[PDB]
């Protein structure tokens, strides 16, 4: 049940300076990057081409190459059209792709100065609830387009799910990898159970007294490691001289029954 995200971000500082950067995710694994400095999209996994032939890939990349240059000029040009309503600095974010189920739904969402304002839907661009009404002129201009609309429809409806089907097949063994959490303890009372190195992201961490789950356990956020594994810490508030008999228990799919138990 994997979601494929192409995340694009663009900063336009003034009329002559801008950059566009993107990264692509399949679930929580990075499949591509496209720095403003490269002419070409970079694979960050061996299987990032999916099942596309080299010729299908070059065609696709070439369309993106034309897109980046064209997008950049369009934004500059829309800024002139709306002056003095909006002005630099401008941030534009696109979040695009498809969510796969067995036997998919596509999306393309646009943010302006960090707010979601525009999506592609059906056969056209439209504003979403909360968007300022001045965006109707840009949208009418974009909807004029016909060639861009057909290409986007094809990308969303056909190219995305077909491509992701191939990616899932080619990246099977990476996507299904099991990496073991290693844990350790410390304090400041506030006791901290650290858990690091685990993949995939589903995990269970509780403080214990023997077999009794300490409901005071405050679980933190999932933090990434550089190697595409995860880090998590669970904290507990206690009285001094009460730390005897406390344990941190960790359950995770990579351990296979044998849970980790660290006694303080």
């Amino acid at each position, epitope marked *: 049940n994997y979601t494929f995200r192409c995340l694009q971000m663009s900063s336009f500082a003034n009329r002559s300076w801008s950059r566009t950067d993107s990264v692509v995710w399949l679930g929580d694994l990075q499949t591509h990057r496209w720095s403003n400095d490269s002419a070409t999209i970079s694979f960050t996994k061996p299987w990032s081409q999916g099942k596309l032939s080299n010729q299908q890939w070059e065609k696709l990349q070439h369309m993106f190459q034309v897109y980046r240059v064209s997008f950049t000029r369009d934004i500059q040009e829309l800024v*002139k059209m709306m*002056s003095p309503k909006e002005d630099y600095p401008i941030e534009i974010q696109l979040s695009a792709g498809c969510e796969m189920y067995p036997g998919s739904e596509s999306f393309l969402h646009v943010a302006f100065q960090g707010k979601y304002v525009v999506r592609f839907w059906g056969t056209s661009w439209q504003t979403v609830p909360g968007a300022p009404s001045w965006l109707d002129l840009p949208i009418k201009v974009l909807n004029a387009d016909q*060639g861009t609309s057909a290409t986007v429809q094809m990308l969303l409806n056909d190219t995305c799910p077909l491509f992701v089907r191939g990616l899932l097949e080619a990246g099977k063994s990476d996507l299904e990898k099991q990496e073991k959490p290693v844990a350790w303890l410390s304090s400041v009372r506030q006791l901290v159970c650290h858990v690091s190195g685990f993949y995939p992201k589903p995990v269970w961490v509780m403080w214990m007294r023997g077999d009794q789950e300490q409901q005071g356990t405050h679980r933190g956020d999932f933090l990434p490691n550089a190697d595409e594994t995860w880090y998590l810490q669970a904290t507990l508030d206690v009285e001094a001289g009460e730390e005897a008999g406390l344990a941190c228990r960790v359950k995770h799919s990579s351990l296979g029954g044998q849970d980790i138990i660290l006694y303080w």
Partner: T-cell receptor
Amino acid sequence: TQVEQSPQSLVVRQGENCVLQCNYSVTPDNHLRWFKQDTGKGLVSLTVLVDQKDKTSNGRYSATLDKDAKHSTLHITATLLDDTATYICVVGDRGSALGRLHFGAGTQLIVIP
Amino acid sequence: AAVTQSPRNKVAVTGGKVTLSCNQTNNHNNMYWYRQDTGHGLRLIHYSYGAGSTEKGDIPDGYKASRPSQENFSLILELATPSQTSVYFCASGDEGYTQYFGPGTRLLVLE
């Protein structure tokens, strides 16, 4: 110059056919238009080609567009004296008003009556 | 969709002020000014996305533009030179890609 037309000029006798070429490097190439400009006067649109491989007709004028080759030809059938004019090739780089037009310098046709 | 230009023809002196006017009743947001010189295609000087807005095209030097209303777009040569001898074409359009051209204006700048 991202839009090149050939020949520069040509002289043809009334009733003969002729062919005008347009080659371009403009990117992207949304559409290509052919204009007829009489001496002194203004720009009269003859046809606009929009597809990857396109063909249009307008009376005695017919045209082709191949976007892979970045190539268009305007064919004139059975030239009349009134075809004496400059023929201009124009490539638009967007399907909207965000587009710039890229003009060729034109091909001069003279039809001998 | 019709566009008119005025004057249609003009003799001017170097260092003089020349104003070329373009009128358009189609309620088009967008207007564009070009010049046509032999051996070149039309080249874009200035354009406008609406009243109050002017933008530099490819060859704006020697020219100011003015868009006082939706209907009128003007090309102002403050200090005319012989190199501004040319045929000038105005156009307009809405959000689509078609630009509708005026009949052109011939300017000769004498020494």
